[PDB]
C-alpha cells in the first residue's frame, strides 16, 4: 500500500487519477476526465489505512473530488470508497456516490451511485 | 411481522404504499405518489423474511416498483431494501435504488440512491 498507491490509475473509461499516499494516511492528487485536456483536472483529497492487515486483505481508502476548477463548476462532488489490492495486477475497486447541490424539492435526485475499478495500466 | 407488515405505510413525503405480506414471504401491493389521484398507483412486489429472529431484530424485506402504469411510463424502476421494526411505532427503514433505462453512454447516471422511512401514521 502507500508506496503501492502512489501513481497514476485509470478506470474503464479513461479517467486518470494521480495520487500521492503519504506516510500518515493522506491521499492527495488530481482527477482528469476523458479527453485529457489541460484542465478537465480537479483536486482530490482522501485518506487510506496506513497500517493495513498483514494477511491478504485490501487497503481501505476513499477520496473526494468537488467538480469545480477554473473552467468548470458542475456544482457537485463525488466520493469514492474502496480498497486497494496490490500485486502483479494491482487495482482499487470502488463504489462512488456523486451528489449535486439541489433545492430541497429536488434533493431526492441529488445522489447517483456507481462503481469504478482503477488499474495502473 | 407478516400480519404486522400488511397495511398502509406512508413516508415523510406522503407516498402511500399498501402491502399484503403473505404466509410464505411474498409482498404484493401498490405504491401511490403524492396528490393521491386515482392512478399515480403502480404495482409492487417484494419478499420479506417470514421466520425472522425472535430476538429484537428487524424483519428484512425489499420490493420493487417499475414506474409504468396506464397513464405514465417513466422508464425506470426502484427497489427498496430494508427492515420492518414493529411495536407501538412500527416502521420500515429503507434505502432505495432508482435506475432509469439509459443508453450505454449514459449508464453512469442511471442509478439514484436514497432512503425512506415509512410509518403507519
Amino acid at each position: 500500500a502507500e508506496a503501492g498507491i502512489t501513481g497514476t490509475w485509470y478506470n474503464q473509461l479513461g479517467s486518470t487519477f494521480i495520487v500521492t499516499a503519504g506516510a500518515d494516511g493522506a491521499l492527495t492528487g488530481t482527477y482528469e476526465s476523458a479527453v485529457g485536456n489541460a484542465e478537465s483536472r480537479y483536486v482530490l483529497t482522501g485518506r487510506y489505512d496506513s497500517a493495513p492487515a498483514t494477511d491478504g486483505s485490501g487497503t481501505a481508502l476513499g477520496w473526494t473530488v468537488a467538480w469545480k476548477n477554473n473552467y468548470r463548476n458542475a456544482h457537485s462532488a463525488t466520493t469514492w470508497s474502496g480498497q486497494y489490492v496490490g500485486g502483479a495486477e494491482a487495482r482499487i475497486n470502488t463504489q462512488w456516490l456523486l451528489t449535486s447541490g439541489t433545492t430541497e424539492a429536488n434533493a431526492w435526485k441529488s445522489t447517483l451511485v456507481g462503481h469504478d475499478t482503477f488499474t495502473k495500466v | 411481522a407478516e400480519a404486522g407488515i400488511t397495511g398502509t405505510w406512508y413516508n415523510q413525503l406522503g407516498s402511500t404504499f399498501i402491502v399484503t405480506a403473505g404466509a410464505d414471504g411474498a409482498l404484493t401491493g401498490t405504491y401511490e405518489s403524492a396528490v393521491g389521484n386515482a392512478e399515480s398507483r403502480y404495482v409492487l412486489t417484494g419478499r420479506y423474511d417470514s421466520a425472522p429472529a425472535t430476538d429484537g431484530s428487524g424483519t428484512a424485506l425489499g420490493w420493487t416498483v417499475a414506474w409504468k402504469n396506464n397513464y405514465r411510463n417513466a422508464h425506470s424502476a426502484t427497489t427498496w431494501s430494508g427492515q420492518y421494526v414493529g411495536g407501538a411505532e412500527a416502521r420500515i427503514n429503507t434505502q432505495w435504488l432508482l435506475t432509469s433505462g439509459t443508453t450505454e453512454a449514459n449508464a453512469w447516471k442511471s442509478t439514484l440512491v436514497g432512503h425512506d422511512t415509512f410509518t403507519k401514521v
Binding site: L13, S15, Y31, S33, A34, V35, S40, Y42, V65, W67, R72, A74, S76, T78, L98 | W108, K109
Partner: peptide
C-alpha cells in the same frame, strides 16, 4: 455530460 466522465 459531467466532468467525472468528460
Amino acid at each position: 455530460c459531467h466532468p467525472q466522465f468528460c
